[PDB]
Short mmCIF file of all heavy atoms in Angstrom, two decimals:
data_model
loop_
_atom_site.label_atom_id
_atom_site.label_comp_id
_atom_site.label_asym_id
_atom_site.label_seq_id
_atom_site.Cartn_x
_atom_site.Cartn_y
_atom_site.Cartn_z
N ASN B 103 30.41 -60.39 60.60
CA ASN B 103 30.30 -61.64 59.86
C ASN B 103 31.58 -62.46 59.86
O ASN B 103 31.57 -63.59 59.36
CB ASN B 103 29.89 -61.34 58.41
CG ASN B 103 28.81 -62.28 57.91
OD1 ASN B 103 28.77 -63.45 58.28
ND2 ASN B 103 27.92 -61.76 57.07
N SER B 104 32.68 -61.94 60.41
CA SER B 104 33.95 -62.66 60.45
C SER B 104 34.55 -62.53 61.85
O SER B 104 35.72 -62.22 62.04
CB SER B 104 34.90 -62.12 59.38
OG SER B 104 35.26 -60.77 59.66
N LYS B 105 33.73 -62.80 62.87
CA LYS B 105 34.10 -62.54 64.25
C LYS B 105 33.85 -63.79 65.08
O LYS B 105 33.12 -64.69 64.69
CB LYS B 105 33.29 -61.37 64.81
CG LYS B 105 33.36 -60.08 63.99
CD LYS B 105 34.77 -59.65 63.61
CE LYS B 105 35.35 -58.74 64.67
NZ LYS B 105 34.81 -57.36 64.56
N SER B 106 34.48 -63.82 66.26
CA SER B 106 34.27 -64.92 67.19
C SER B 106 34.04 -64.45 68.62
O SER B 106 33.93 -65.30 69.51
CB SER B 106 35.47 -65.88 67.15
OG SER B 106 35.63 -66.43 65.85
N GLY B 107 33.96 -63.15 68.87
CA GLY B 107 33.66 -62.67 70.21
C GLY B 107 34.71 -62.97 71.24
O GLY B 107 34.38 -63.19 72.41
N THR B 108 35.98 -62.99 70.86
CA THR B 108 37.05 -63.17 71.83
C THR B 108 37.42 -61.84 72.46
O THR B 108 37.12 -60.76 71.94
CB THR B 108 38.28 -63.80 71.17
OG1 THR B 108 38.78 -62.92 70.16
CG2 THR B 108 37.93 -65.14 70.55
N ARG B 109 38.11 -61.92 73.60
CA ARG B 109 38.49 -60.70 74.31
C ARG B 109 39.32 -59.79 73.43
O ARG B 109 39.06 -58.58 73.35
CB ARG B 109 39.25 -61.06 75.59
N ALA B 110 40.33 -60.34 72.76
CA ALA B 110 41.12 -59.54 71.83
C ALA B 110 40.25 -59.04 70.68
O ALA B 110 40.40 -57.89 70.24
CB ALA B 110 42.29 -60.36 71.29
N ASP B 111 39.34 -59.87 70.19
CA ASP B 111 38.48 -59.46 69.09
C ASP B 111 37.55 -58.32 69.49
O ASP B 111 37.39 -57.36 68.74
CB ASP B 111 37.67 -60.65 68.58
CG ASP B 111 36.92 -60.33 67.31
OD1 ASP B 111 37.01 -59.17 66.85
OD2 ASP B 111 36.24 -61.23 66.78
N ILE B 112 36.93 -58.41 70.67
CA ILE B 112 35.97 -57.39 71.08
C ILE B 112 36.66 -56.03 71.17
O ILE B 112 36.08 -55.01 70.79
CB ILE B 112 35.31 -57.78 72.41
CG1 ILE B 112 34.37 -58.97 72.21
CG2 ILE B 112 34.54 -56.60 72.98
CD1 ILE B 112 34.06 -59.72 73.48
N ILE B 113 37.88 -56.00 71.69
CA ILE B 113 38.60 -54.73 71.81
C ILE B 113 38.77 -54.10 70.44
O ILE B 113 38.65 -52.88 70.28
CB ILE B 113 39.95 -54.95 72.51
CG1 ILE B 113 39.73 -55.29 73.98
CG2 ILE B 113 40.82 -53.71 72.37
CD1 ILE B 113 40.94 -55.91 74.66
N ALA B 114 39.05 -54.92 69.42
CA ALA B 114 39.27 -54.39 68.08
C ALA B 114 38.05 -53.66 67.54
O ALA B 114 38.20 -52.56 66.98
CB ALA B 114 39.67 -55.51 67.13
N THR B 115 36.86 -54.23 67.69
CA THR B 115 35.67 -53.57 67.15
C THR B 115 35.36 -52.28 67.89
O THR B 115 35.01 -51.27 67.27
CB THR B 115 34.47 -54.52 67.19
OG1 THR B 115 33.29 -53.82 66.77
CG2 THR B 115 34.24 -55.09 68.59
N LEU B 116 35.49 -52.29 69.22
CA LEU B 116 35.26 -51.06 69.98
C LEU B 116 36.32 -50.01 69.66
O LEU B 116 36.11 -48.82 69.90
CB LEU B 116 35.25 -51.35 71.48
CG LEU B 116 34.24 -52.40 71.95
CD1 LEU B 116 34.19 -52.42 73.47
CD2 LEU B 116 32.86 -52.14 71.38
N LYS B 117 37.47 -50.44 69.14
CA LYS B 117 38.55 -49.51 68.85
C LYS B 117 38.15 -48.48 67.80
O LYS B 117 38.60 -47.33 67.87
CB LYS B 117 39.78 -50.29 68.38
CG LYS B 117 41.09 -49.51 68.35
CD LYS B 117 41.42 -48.84 69.68
CE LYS B 117 41.80 -49.85 70.75
NZ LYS B 117 42.87 -49.34 71.64
N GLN B 118 37.32 -48.86 66.83
CA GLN B 118 36.95 -47.95 65.75
C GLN B 118 35.92 -46.92 66.17
O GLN B 118 35.67 -45.98 65.40
N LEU B 119 35.31 -47.05 67.35
CA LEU B 119 34.26 -46.14 67.78
C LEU B 119 34.69 -45.16 68.86
O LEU B 119 33.98 -44.17 69.08
CB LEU B 119 33.05 -46.93 68.31
CG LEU B 119 32.53 -48.03 67.39
CD1 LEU B 119 31.40 -48.78 68.08
CD2 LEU B 119 32.06 -47.44 66.07
N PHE B 120 35.83 -45.39 69.53
CA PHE B 120 36.22 -44.53 70.64
C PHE B 120 37.71 -44.19 70.62
O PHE B 120 38.27 -43.91 71.69
CB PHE B 120 35.87 -45.19 71.97
CG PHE B 120 34.44 -45.64 72.06
CD1 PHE B 120 34.14 -46.97 72.29
CD2 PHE B 120 33.41 -44.74 71.91
CE1 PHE B 120 32.82 -47.39 72.37
CE2 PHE B 120 32.09 -45.15 71.98
CZ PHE B 120 31.80 -46.48 72.22
N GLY B 121 38.36 -44.19 69.46
CA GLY B 121 39.77 -43.85 69.44
C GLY B 121 40.61 -44.94 70.09
O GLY B 121 40.17 -46.07 70.29
N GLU B 122 41.84 -44.58 70.43
CA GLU B 122 42.79 -45.54 70.98
C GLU B 122 42.57 -45.81 72.46
O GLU B 122 42.48 -46.97 72.87
N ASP B 123 42.47 -44.75 73.27
CA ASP B 123 42.37 -44.90 74.71
C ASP B 123 40.96 -44.68 75.25
O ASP B 123 40.79 -44.61 76.47
CB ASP B 123 43.33 -43.93 75.40
CG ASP B 123 42.99 -42.48 75.12
OD1 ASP B 123 42.03 -42.22 74.36
OD2 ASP B 123 43.68 -41.59 75.67
N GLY B 124 39.96 -44.57 74.38
CA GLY B 124 38.63 -44.23 74.82
C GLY B 124 37.82 -45.37 75.39
O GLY B 124 36.69 -45.13 75.85
N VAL B 125 38.34 -46.60 75.40
CA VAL B 125 37.56 -47.75 75.82
C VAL B 125 38.46 -48.71 76.59
O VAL B 125 39.65 -48.84 76.31
CB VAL B 125 36.91 -48.47 74.62
CG1 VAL B 125 37.96 -48.83 73.58
CG2 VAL B 125 36.14 -49.70 75.08
N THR B 126 37.86 -49.38 77.58
CA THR B 126 38.53 -50.43 78.34
C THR B 126 37.47 -51.44 78.77
O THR B 126 36.28 -51.12 78.81
CB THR B 126 39.25 -49.87 79.57
OG1 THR B 126 38.34 -49.09 80.36
CG2 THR B 126 40.43 -49.00 79.15
N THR B 127 37.92 -52.66 79.08
CA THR B 127 37.00 -53.76 79.35
C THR B 127 37.49 -54.56 80.55
O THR B 127 38.60 -55.09 80.54
CB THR B 127 36.87 -54.67 78.12
OG1 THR B 127 38.18 -55.03 77.66
CG2 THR B 127 36.12 -53.95 77.01
N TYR B 128 36.66 -54.63 81.59
CA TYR B 128 36.91 -55.50 82.72
C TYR B 128 36.19 -56.84 82.52
O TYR B 128 35.19 -56.93 81.81
CB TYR B 128 36.44 -54.85 84.02
CG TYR B 128 36.69 -55.68 85.26
CD1 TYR B 128 37.97 -55.78 85.80
CD2 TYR B 128 35.66 -56.35 85.89
CE1 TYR B 128 38.20 -56.54 86.93
CE2 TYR B 128 35.88 -57.10 87.02
CZ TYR B 128 37.15 -57.19 87.54
OH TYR B 128 37.38 -57.95 88.67
N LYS B 129 36.72 -57.88 83.17
CA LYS B 129 36.19 -59.22 83.04
C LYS B 129 35.88 -59.79 84.41
O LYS B 129 36.56 -59.46 85.39
CB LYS B 129 37.16 -60.14 82.32
CG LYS B 129 36.56 -61.54 82.23
CD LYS B 129 37.51 -62.45 81.46
CE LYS B 129 36.91 -63.85 81.38
NZ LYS B 129 37.83 -64.73 80.64
N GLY B 130 34.86 -60.64 84.48
CA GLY B 130 34.43 -61.21 85.74
C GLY B 130 34.38 -62.73 85.72
O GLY B 130 34.42 -63.34 84.65
N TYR B 131 34.29 -63.34 86.90
CA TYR B 131 34.40 -64.79 87.01
C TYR B 131 33.20 -65.51 86.39
O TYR B 131 33.37 -66.44 85.59
CB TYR B 131 34.56 -65.20 88.46
CG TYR B 131 35.92 -64.78 88.97
CD1 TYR B 131 36.12 -63.46 89.39
CD2 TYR B 131 36.97 -65.70 89.02
CE1 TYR B 131 37.38 -63.07 89.87
CE2 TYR B 131 38.22 -65.31 89.50
CZ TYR B 131 38.43 -63.99 89.92
OH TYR B 131 39.65 -63.61 90.38
N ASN B 132 31.99 -65.09 86.76
CA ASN B 132 30.77 -65.79 86.32
C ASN B 132 30.14 -65.02 85.16
O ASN B 132 29.13 -64.33 85.30
CB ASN B 132 29.81 -65.95 87.48
CG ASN B 132 29.34 -64.63 88.05
OD1 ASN B 132 30.15 -63.78 88.40
ND2 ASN B 132 28.03 -64.45 88.13
N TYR B 133 30.76 -65.16 83.99
CA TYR B 133 30.24 -64.63 82.73
C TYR B 133 30.11 -63.11 82.73
O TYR B 133 29.58 -62.54 81.77
CB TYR B 133 28.88 -65.25 82.38
CG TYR B 133 28.92 -66.73 82.07
CD1 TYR B 133 27.83 -67.54 82.34
CD2 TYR B 133 30.05 -67.31 81.52
CE1 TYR B 133 27.86 -68.89 82.06
CE2 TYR B 133 30.09 -68.66 81.23
CZ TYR B 133 28.99 -69.45 81.51
OH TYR B 133 29.02 -70.79 81.23
N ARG B 134 30.58 -62.44 83.77
CA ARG B 134 30.46 -60.99 83.83
C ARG B 134 31.49 -60.32 82.92
O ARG B 134 32.67 -60.68 82.92
CB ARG B 134 30.64 -60.49 85.26
CG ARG B 134 29.47 -60.81 86.18
CD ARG B 134 28.27 -59.90 85.93
NE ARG B 134 28.63 -58.51 85.64
CZ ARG B 134 29.34 -57.72 86.42
NH1 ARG B 134 29.77 -58.12 87.61
NH2 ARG B 134 29.64 -56.49 86.01
N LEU B 135 31.02 -59.33 82.16
CA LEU B 135 31.89 -58.49 81.35
C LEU B 135 31.44 -57.05 81.50
O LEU B 135 30.25 -56.78 81.67
CB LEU B 135 31.87 -58.90 79.88
CG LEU B 135 32.79 -58.06 78.98
CD1 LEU B 135 33.52 -58.96 77.99
CD2 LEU B 135 32.00 -56.99 78.24
N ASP B 136 32.39 -56.12 81.43
CA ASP B 136 32.12 -54.70 81.61
C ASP B 136 32.75 -53.91 80.48
O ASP B 136 33.84 -54.25 80.00
CB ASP B 136 32.66 -54.21 82.96
CG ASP B 136 31.90 -54.78 84.13
OD1 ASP B 136 30.70 -55.08 83.98
OD2 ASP B 136 32.50 -54.94 85.22
N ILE B 137 32.08 -52.85 80.07
CA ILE B 137 32.56 -51.95 79.02
C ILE B 137 32.63 -50.54 79.59
O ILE B 137 31.69 -50.07 80.24
CB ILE B 137 31.65 -51.99 77.78
CG1 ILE B 137 31.66 -53.40 77.18
CG2 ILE B 137 32.11 -50.96 76.76
CD1 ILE B 137 30.73 -53.57 75.99
N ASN B 138 33.76 -49.88 79.36
CA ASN B 138 34.00 -48.52 79.84
C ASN B 138 34.26 -47.62 78.64
O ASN B 138 34.99 -48.01 77.73
CB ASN B 138 35.18 -48.49 80.80
CG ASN B 138 34.89 -49.19 82.11
OD1 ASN B 138 33.80 -49.06 82.67
ND2 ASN B 138 35.86 -49.95 82.61
N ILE B 139 33.67 -46.43 78.66
CA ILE B 139 33.81 -45.47 77.57
C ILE B 139 34.31 -44.16 78.14
O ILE B 139 33.81 -43.68 79.16
CB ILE B 139 32.47 -45.28 76.83
CG1 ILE B 139 32.01 -46.59 76.20
CG2 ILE B 139 32.61 -44.21 75.76
CD1 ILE B 139 30.54 -46.63 75.87
N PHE B 140 35.31 -43.57 77.47
CA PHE B 140 35.92 -42.33 77.92
C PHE B 140 35.79 -41.18 76.94
O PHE B 140 35.72 -40.03 77.39
CB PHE B 140 37.42 -42.55 78.20
CG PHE B 140 37.70 -43.68 79.14
CD1 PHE B 140 38.85 -44.44 79.00
CD2 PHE B 140 36.83 -43.98 80.17
CE1 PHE B 140 39.11 -45.48 79.86
CE2 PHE B 140 37.09 -45.03 81.04
CZ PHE B 140 38.24 -45.78 80.88
N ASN B 141 35.75 -41.44 75.64
CA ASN B 141 35.78 -40.37 74.65
C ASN B 141 34.73 -40.58 73.57
O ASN B 141 35.03 -40.49 72.37
CB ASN B 141 37.17 -40.27 74.02
CG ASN B 141 37.33 -39.04 73.14
OD1 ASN B 141 36.39 -38.26 72.96
ND2 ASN B 141 38.52 -38.86 72.58
N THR B 142 33.50 -40.88 73.97
CA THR B 142 32.43 -41.08 73.00
C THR B 142 32.21 -39.81 72.17
O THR B 142 32.20 -38.70 72.70
CB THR B 142 31.13 -41.47 73.70
OG1 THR B 142 30.18 -41.94 72.73
CG2 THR B 142 30.54 -40.29 74.45
N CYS B 143 32.05 -39.99 70.86
CA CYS B 143 31.75 -38.90 69.95
C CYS B 143 30.35 -38.99 69.36
O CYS B 143 29.98 -38.14 68.55
CB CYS B 143 32.78 -38.87 68.82
SG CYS B 143 32.67 -40.27 67.68
N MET B 144 29.57 -40.00 69.75
CA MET B 144 28.21 -40.16 69.27
C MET B 144 27.35 -40.68 70.42
O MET B 144 27.85 -41.25 71.39
CB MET B 144 28.14 -41.12 68.08
N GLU B 145 26.05 -40.46 70.29
CA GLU B 145 25.12 -40.91 71.32
C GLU B 145 25.02 -42.43 71.28
O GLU B 145 24.84 -43.02 70.21
CB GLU B 145 23.75 -40.26 71.10
CG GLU B 145 22.78 -40.45 72.25
CD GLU B 145 22.06 -41.77 72.20
OE1 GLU B 145 21.87 -42.31 71.10
OE2 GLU B 145 21.68 -42.27 73.28
N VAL B 146 25.13 -43.07 72.45
CA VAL B 146 25.37 -44.51 72.50
C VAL B 146 24.11 -45.35 72.59
O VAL B 146 24.15 -46.53 72.23
CB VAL B 146 26.28 -44.86 73.69
CG1 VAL B 146 27.62 -44.16 73.55
CG2 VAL B 146 25.62 -44.51 75.02
N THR B 147 22.98 -44.79 73.05
CA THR B 147 21.80 -45.62 73.28
C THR B 147 21.34 -46.27 71.98
O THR B 147 20.95 -47.44 71.96
CB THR B 147 20.67 -44.80 73.90
OG1 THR B 147 20.29 -43.75 73.01
CG2 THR B 147 21.11 -44.22 75.24
N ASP B 148 21.37 -45.52 70.88
CA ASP B 148 20.97 -46.06 69.59
C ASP B 148 21.97 -47.06 69.03
O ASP B 148 21.59 -47.94 68.26
CB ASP B 148 20.77 -44.91 68.59
CG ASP B 148 22.04 -44.14 68.32
OD1 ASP B 148 23.07 -44.46 68.95
OD2 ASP B 148 22.01 -43.21 67.49
N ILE B 149 23.25 -46.95 69.41
CA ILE B 149 24.24 -47.92 68.98
C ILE B 149 24.22 -49.15 69.86
O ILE B 149 24.72 -50.21 69.46
CB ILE B 149 25.64 -47.27 68.98
CG1 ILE B 149 25.72 -46.18 67.90
CG2 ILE B 149 26.72 -48.33 68.75
CD1 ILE B 149 26.98 -45.35 67.95
N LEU B 150 23.65 -49.06 71.06
CA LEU B 150 23.70 -50.16 72.01
C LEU B 150 23.21 -51.48 71.45
O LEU B 150 23.87 -52.51 71.72
N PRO B 151 22.11 -51.56 70.70
CA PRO B 151 21.61 -52.89 70.30
C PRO B 151 22.65 -53.73 69.59
O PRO B 151 22.72 -54.94 69.82
CB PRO B 151 20.42 -52.55 69.39
CG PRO B 151 20.00 -51.18 69.82
CD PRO B 151 21.26 -50.48 70.18
N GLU B 152 23.47 -53.12 68.73
CA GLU B 152 24.52 -53.86 68.06
C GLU B 152 25.61 -54.31 69.02
O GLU B 152 26.10 -55.44 68.89
N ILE B 153 25.99 -53.46 69.97
CA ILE B 153 27.04 -53.81 70.92
C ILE B 153 26.76 -55.11 71.65
O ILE B 153 27.69 -55.75 72.14
CB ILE B 153 27.24 -52.68 71.95
CG1 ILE B 153 27.45 -51.33 71.25
CG2 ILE B 153 28.42 -52.99 72.86
CD1 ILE B 153 28.47 -51.36 70.14
#
Side-chain angles (χ1 to χ4, degrees), chain B residues 103-108 110-117 119-121 123-143 145-149 151 153:
Chain B
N103 225 325
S104 66
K105 306 311 270 282
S106 299
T108 62
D111 189 358
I112 290 160
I113 290 163
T115 175
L116 304 189
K117 194 53 71 143
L119 309 176
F120 308 121
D123 63 358
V125 55
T126 54
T127 51
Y128 182 76
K129 179 178 180 180
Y131 290 81
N132 62 306
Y133 294 150
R134 288 284 322 302
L135 181 138
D136 291 331
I137 298 176
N138 291 319
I139 298 160
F140 306 147
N141 189 359
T142 192
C143 68
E145 191 277 332
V146 300
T147 62
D148 63 358
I149 294 172
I153 308 312

